């Protein structure tokens, strides 16, 4: 029955690192975006579009590692 | 067909190797021990892609003209444009060989990689169930030895060009004094500079190789692990992306070749 604890520990690492990656990427990107917004507030509705169109491309891999941890926990037990 | 997914996957991890003493075919289940067992699948693809690049080019080369080029000729001269554009600024010496070196590297590597987009199982089928061949795979660069041979060729060339264009008398000074220049450090200096030299062909080989080994792997898994109505939906994005890597790695190899040599000779 040791198996069914390390099966959760793998999910612990697998889904902690993913949260860190997502948070860091989005935070840096949003910070630079906000500086761009503040230096020209007339321009926001363009920069924000570009922001989302990039941000998805960061979070791609967090959201697959999350998924594999979800699989290992809920399905594999 | 008793191949479990874990087991089916294996057959693509398997090469179709020769054994030169026996000219025999090394079966997948038992791998003979020796250094004398050629990888036929990598070789046939290597030579066929190289030759069908050279044919397309040399057919027009004999015929090239200064009128408006033929469209096929237009593409030839446009890739000549990218090639000569890179050569034109990163190289400054007289040598002839640099330009065709870089060209034959670029397009040939691209072709060796170009095959990966081929549906992964298709051609191994005509290998096994038609011509009676026990296993196969269809990307030469995913077989280490070609990248090793090419990058250690560049290694030979680094030695060769550098010694040609500044001699041993200065080559020893560089290889021993740097980076600290003060005479007590020389023995320790050369150790750090030595493998610093060798990591260039080694990294040239490995950066390329790993990308295509791991490229094929994803298609192997796409085939093995998913139902028909979902193998296509990962494969659309994965092709969308792998376009990029298979182009970038050839461009990298070209530029890195030229840069590595230029640093030593110029």
């Amino acid at each position: 029955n040791l198996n069914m604890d390390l099966l959760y520990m793998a999910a612990a690492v697998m889904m902690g690192l993913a949260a860190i990656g997502a948070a860091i990427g989005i935070g840096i990107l949003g910070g630079k975006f906000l500086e761009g917004a503040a230096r020209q507030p007339d321009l926001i509705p363009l920069l924000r579009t570009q922001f989302f169109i990039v941000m998805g491309l960061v979070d791609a891999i967090p959201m697959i590692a999350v998924g594999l941890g979800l699989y290992v926990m809920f399905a594999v037990a | 067909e008793n191949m479990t997914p874990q087991d089916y996957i294996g057959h693509h991890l398997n090469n179709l190797q020769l054994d030169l003493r026996t000219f025999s075919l090394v079966d997948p289940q038992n791998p003979p021990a020796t250094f004398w067992t050629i990888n036929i699948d990598s070789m046939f693809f290597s030579v066929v892609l190289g030759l069908l690049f050279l044919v397309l080019f040399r057919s027009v080369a004999k015929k090239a003209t200064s009128g408006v080029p033929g469209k096929f000729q237009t593409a030839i001269e446009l890739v000549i444009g990218f090639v000569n554009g890179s050569v034109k600024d990163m190289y400054h010496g007289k040598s002839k060989l640099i330009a065709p070196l870089a060209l034959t590297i670029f397009v040939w590597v691209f072709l060796m990689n170009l095959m990966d987009l081929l549906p992964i199982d298709l051609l191994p089928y005509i290998a096994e169930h038609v011509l009676g061949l026990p296993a196969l795979r269809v990307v030469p660069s995913a077989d280490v030895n070609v990248t090793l041979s090419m990058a250690l060729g560049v290694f030979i060339l680094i030695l060769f060009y550098s010694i040609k264009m500044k001699g041993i008398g200065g080559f020893t000074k560089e290889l021993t004094l740097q980076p600290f220049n003060h005479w007590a450090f020389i023995p320790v200096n050369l150790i750090l500079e030595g493998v610093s030299l060798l990591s260039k062909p080694v990294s040239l080989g490995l950066r390329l190789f790993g990308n295509m080994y791991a490229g094929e792997l994803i298609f192997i898994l796409i085939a093995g692990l998913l139902p028909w109505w979902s193998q296509w939906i990962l494969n659309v994005p994965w092709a969308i992306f792998h376009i990029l890597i298979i182009t970038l790695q050839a461009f990298i190899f070209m530029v890195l070749t030229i840069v590595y040599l230029s640093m030593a000779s110029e």
Binding site: - | G67, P69, P227, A239
Partner: protein, 52 residues
């Protein structure tokens, strides 16, 4: 396991991949070629106007 279903899967995959290539990738290829050919052709045309 059945080897066949991978065949239908990779058929769908390659068909849609080729749609992507043709509709998005062949146009830029042919368009850069046509652009280069325009440059060559009008270059020679104006050169011949100059030699007139």
């Amino acid at each position: 396991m059945n080897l066949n279903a991978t065949i239908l899967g990779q058929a769908i995959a390659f068909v849609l991949f080729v749609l992507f290539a043709m509709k998005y990738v062949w146009p830029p290829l042919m368009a850069a070629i046509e652009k280069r050919q325009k440059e060559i052709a009008d270059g020679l045309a104006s050169a011949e106007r100059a030699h007139k």
